[PDB]
């Protein structure tokens, strides 16, 4: 409750201010106050906070209540992880141009998800715990904070509004499974080559939303050199470590996983190049390291 009072007073510095529009943001130097507030600027930029009338000490609780059911514990999958897929969600939407393709609810449900696609992760070699298990996993507890009481920033919307958001938000999160990225992504491409690609259709929309999230949960790939490099080192180190091999495995996951994914995703919008850039200079300096 004393960290709501400082979050829930301060004031939220601007988008510029806070570098959230660059496909280049990075959280290392900043605290988790600072990344609460960045997060706020991110609802109020996208108006989601005006369209939504969104209390502000509610907004604050929840983005709280969020981050804290993340493990600290766990090496990669934690909150600064879904804060920056988030981040890459607000700069794909502002400097990538993606806003103006999506509607209120599309973009209010992708932020929320963004940010919670991977709640209560408790590490790859820690899932003994328990068709994605832990997506779903991951949205009952997105669901249960957002009817968490006080935490309700999907209060104003009508329930017409607010299962349109919700069954968005559930897809969005299950997307992050790379098992369904896997099966889906053939269709993707198979429509990007034939230049049918039409998101009026329905089916397409949601096509669309499903690799967009994957697109920014993976997007790390996509950093500077400095920057992939030390978050390769905190995947490795969970991955291994249970809380070096490394460049041969980066190299086979950006051809496997990474690289069509964002060249399509450039394709539908030529202003995120930058993060299919930024994807191919790290395959290059991975490559490198790997022939010794
Ligand atoms: O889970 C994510 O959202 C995520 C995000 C980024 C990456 C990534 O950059 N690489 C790899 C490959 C991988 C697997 C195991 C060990 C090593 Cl070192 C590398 N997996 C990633 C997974
Ligand atoms: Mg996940
Ligand atoms: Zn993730």
């Not at 939407?93 to 709640?119: R, Y």
């Not at 850039?277 to 490198?288: L, V």
Request: hydrophobic share 45%; with cysteine.
């Amino acid at each position: 409750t004393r960290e709501l009072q400082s979050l829930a007073a301060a004031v939220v510095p601007s988008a510029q201010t806070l570098k959230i529009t660059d496909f280049s943001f990075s959280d290392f130097e900043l605290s988790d106050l600072e990344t609460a507030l960045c997060t706020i600027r991110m609802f109020t930029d996208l108006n989601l906070v005006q369209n939504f009338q969104m209390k502000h000490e509610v907004l604050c609780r929840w983005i709280l209540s969020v981050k804290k059911n993340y493990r600290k514990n766990v090496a990669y999958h934690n909150w600064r992880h879904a804060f920056n897929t988030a981040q890459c969600m607000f700069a794909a939407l502002k400097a990538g141009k993606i806003q103006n393709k999506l509607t209120d609810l599309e973009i209010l449900a992708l932020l929320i998800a963004a940010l919670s696609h991977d709640l209560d992760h408790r590490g790859v070699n820690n899932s003994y715990i328990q068709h994605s298990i832990m997506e779903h996993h991951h949205f009952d507890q997105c669901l249960m904070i957002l009817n968490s009481p006080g935490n309700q920033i999907l209060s104003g919307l009508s329930i017409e509004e607010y299962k349109t958001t919700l069954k968005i938000i559930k897809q969005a999160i299950l997307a992050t499974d790379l098992a369904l990225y896997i099966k889906r992504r053939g269709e993707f491409f198979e429509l990007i080559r034939k230049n049918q690609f039409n998101l009026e259709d329905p089916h397409q929309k949601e096509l669309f939303l499903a690799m967009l999230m994957t697109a920014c949960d993976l997007s790390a790939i996509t950093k500077p050199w400095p920057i992939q490099q030390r978050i390769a080192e905190l995947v490795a180190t969970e991955f291994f470590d249970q809380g070096n091999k490394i460049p041969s495995m980066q190299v086979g996951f950006i051809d496997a996983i990474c690289l069509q994914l964002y060249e399509a995703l450039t394709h539908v919008s030529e202003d995120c190049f930058p993060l299919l850039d930024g994807c191919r200079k790290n395959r290059q300096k991975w490559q490198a390291l790997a022939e010794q």
